[PDB]
Amino acid sequence: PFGEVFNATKFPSVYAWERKKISNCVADYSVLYNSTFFSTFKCYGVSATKLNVYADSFVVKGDDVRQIAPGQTGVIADYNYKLPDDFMGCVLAWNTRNIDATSTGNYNYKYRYLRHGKLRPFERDISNVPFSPDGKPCTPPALNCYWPLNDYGFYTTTGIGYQPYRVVVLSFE
């Protein structure tokens, strides 16, 4: 039931990425291999078939797509979606300017840019609490209080690295 994932009319914001569990099924993966539809198709495990899985959906910026690999400096890796060090399967990205961007600006896609400490692999931070770099409760418009969640702002006219990319991460156990 993979088409129910790639081709889902809407995608999650990275910070609130979705995990869809797939078990008791058989897949060819041929539906994937052959396709210039995919800008990034990088596996971190193998390239065969066994007919047996987790599918993680979300949207990031072209330039962010690199952060969805083991290792990687961060911000999207650091605070949003972290892949594990060794352990892995595949990662699929693709350009969605025509769907997820407008000539006016599209700001529905959120990401988190502030947090006390990075995430653990596959951890998920859904909270939206005002932030101060030394703990302590916060009440904006105050100085040094900020909202940890930022809006992406995807426009047709931007460069490729600033265009929205629907990403799907496949995980194997």
């Binding site: 600006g105 502030l114 040094n144 006219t157 460069g159 490729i160």
Partner: protein, 597 residues
């Protein structure tokens, strides 16, 4: 978390918010310049207002972090940049009024017109009206008329406004702990903390004045030759030991001697370098002009233009029905969105213009990955300097050959080369004493060194002494001749034109050296030389990131502006000059004027 930790988090929040407002500001501003509708001027203001209001709000907040509590250039530099206080340091009314002045000076120079006393039904603007006269007219009096009219109508109008402008602007600079507004402007060249790479504001004057002495010999010879030539076009109007009548210099001010070429050309027999007609012969469209420019830049190992550039750029005027502003520009909108707006005609000048403009885009692209606040040329003199470089290599007879534009049989005899070099000097060398002089006055006016009652008296004294140029009609303090030039009455520092002019030759020489070029520096072509690109990209990728001194040392290998490469370029003309002037007077009398008395 310390002050420095609280600063990074503050800056980060800025960059992200700035990207959006600024992107919106730019796209709106672009759509205007490309689609002049009343719905668009409404939008450009909309987005420009938010983005400006935001900056103010942010700077005022940024001032709540002391920058000498930070041992980290990168962040220290960002925080400092955001600390553009503005005229917000002044009171409510000294800010509204100043902006009133700023806007009125602007609108006067832009709408100012003068009318033919012999035919008052025809009133001419600067562009294209008066300007056309100043470029092409051979009639001393018509020329005299235009010149005087402009300074006599719009000049006198700007006089009072400019006076108050100077007081109001000075208070601001004082309140920001600068000596004067001049000192404020010199600020752009300043560097604090790095050792040897440091540069003070005053060191600029020093380095300008020292470097300018080494220019006089060349200029004096250029001057002497053109004086002789002009004597022929206006016999009896000009003295062979005197200054050059200010209104005979090729344009409204004599900022450039370019249009004197027709009557100063050394070897009038030799034909074109102009490939204007060679380009048409092959039905070349804009697509080819830029693809070529692009091919030029890829040749030195730099990247293709972005798909978005080809998709979103405006390469040709739509004419009427959707009209646009047609001045050639390179746009850096943000979000990796680069584009050029240029009403491409098919001339050689435009082919070359594309190479300048696309230099900018290449620069803008290189420094994209830098922090938002740090994306810009190393100083005000850098962007254009990179621009001119590209124009220089593209126009070499070697390069036009390579492209398949110059006839492969055309050889470089001693005459076509002096011809061209003179054309170069008429613009490049000609403009340097004028530019120095202009700021010299400006700077001194802001220090108080030149009193109101001697503004014009001191201007013309300096135009005579420094420039070799004289007023054809005398001017009391009812005038304000300097402000009759765009940059003055539109509040832009003018020294960038000098420092750049030298930078660009420093760049050239060092890039041509990197590129194993054999002959005179003026025939150079960095095309196909990747190691040049690398030497250039090394500073191109820096942006405003590291001090311009290091940025320069990256490409040239020296921490300062050196005039020596500039001379080198014009060395074969300088010799010719010294010999052509064998029996001509070289220098001028500050005492002789054309109205005399």
């Amino acid at each position: 978390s310390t002050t420095e930790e609280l600063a990074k988090t503050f800056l980060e929040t800025f960059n992200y918010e700035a990207q959006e407002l600024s992107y919106q500001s730019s796209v709106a501003s672009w759509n205007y310049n490309t689609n002049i509708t009343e719905e668009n001027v409404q939008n450009m203001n909309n987005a420009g207002d938010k983005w400006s209001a935001f900056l103010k709000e942010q700077s005022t907040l940024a001032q709540m972090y002391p920058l000498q509590e930070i041992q980290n250039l990168t962040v220290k530099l960002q925080l400092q940049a955001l600390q553009q206080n503005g005229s917000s340091v002044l009171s409510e009314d000294k800010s509204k009024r100043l902006n009133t002045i700023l806007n009125t000076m602007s609108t006067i120079y832009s709408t100012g017109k003068v009318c033919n006393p012999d035919n008052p039904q025809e009133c001419l603007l600067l562009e294209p009206g008066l300007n056309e006269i100043m470029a092409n007219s051979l009639d001393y009096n018509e020329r005299l008329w235009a010149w005087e009219s402009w300074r006599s109508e719009v000049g006198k109008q700007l006089r009072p406004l400019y006076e108050e402008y100077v007081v109001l602007k000075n208070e601001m600079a004082r309140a920001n702990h600068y000596e004067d507004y001049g000192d404020y402007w010199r600020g752009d060249y300043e560097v604090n903390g790095v050792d040897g790479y440091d540069y003070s504001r005053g060191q600029l004057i020093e380095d300008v004045e020292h470097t300018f002495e080494e220019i006089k010999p060349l200029y004096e010879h250029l001057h002497a030759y053109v004086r002789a030539k002009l004597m022929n076009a206006y016999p009896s109007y000009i003295s062979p030991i005197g200054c050059l009548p200010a209104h005979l210099l090729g344009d409204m001010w004599g900022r450039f001697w370019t249009n004197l070429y027709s009557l100063t050309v050394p070897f009038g027999q030799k034909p074109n370098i102009d490939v204007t007609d060679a380009m048409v012969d092959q039905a070349w469209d804009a697509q080819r002009i830029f693809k070529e420019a692009e091919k030029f830049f890829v040749s030195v190992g730099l990247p293709n233009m972005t798909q978005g550039f080809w998709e979103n750029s405006m390469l040709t005027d739509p004419g009427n029905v959707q009209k646009a502003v047609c001045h050639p520009t390179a746009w850096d909108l943000g979000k990796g969105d680069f584009r050029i707006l240029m009403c491409t005609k098919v001339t050689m000048d435009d082919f070359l213009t594309a190479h300048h403009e696309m230099g900018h885009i290449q620069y803008d692209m290189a420094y994209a990955a830098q922090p938002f606040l740090l994306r810009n040329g190393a100083n005000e003199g850098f962007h254009e300097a990179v621009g001119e470089i590209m124009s220089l290599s593209a126009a070499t007879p070697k390069h036009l050959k390579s492209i398949g534009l110059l006839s492969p049989d055309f050889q470089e005899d001693n005459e076509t080369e002096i011809n061209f070099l003179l054309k170069q000097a008429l613009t490049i060398v000609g403009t340097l004493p004028f530019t120095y002089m202009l700021e010299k006055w400006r700077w001194m006016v802001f220090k108080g060194e030149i009193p109101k009652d001697q503004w014009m008296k001191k201007w013309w004294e300096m135009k005579r002494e420094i420039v070799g140029v004289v007023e054809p009609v005398p001017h009391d303090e009812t005038y304000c001749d300097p402000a009759s030039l765009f940059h003055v009455s539109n509040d832009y520092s003018f020294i960038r034109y000098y420092t750049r002019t030298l930078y660009q030759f420093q760049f050239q020489e060092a890039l041509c050296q990197a590129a194993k070029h054999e002959g005179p520096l003026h025939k150079c072509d960095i095309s196909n030389s990747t190691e040049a690109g690398q030497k250039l990209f090394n500073m191109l990728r820096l942006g405003k990131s590291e001090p311009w001194t290091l940025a320069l040392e990256n490409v040239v290998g020296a921490k300062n502006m050196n005039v020596r490469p500039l001379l080198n370029y014009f060395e074969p003309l300088f010799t010719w000059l010294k010999d052509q002037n064998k029996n001509s007077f070289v220098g001028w009398s500050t005492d002789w004027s054309p109205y005399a008395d």
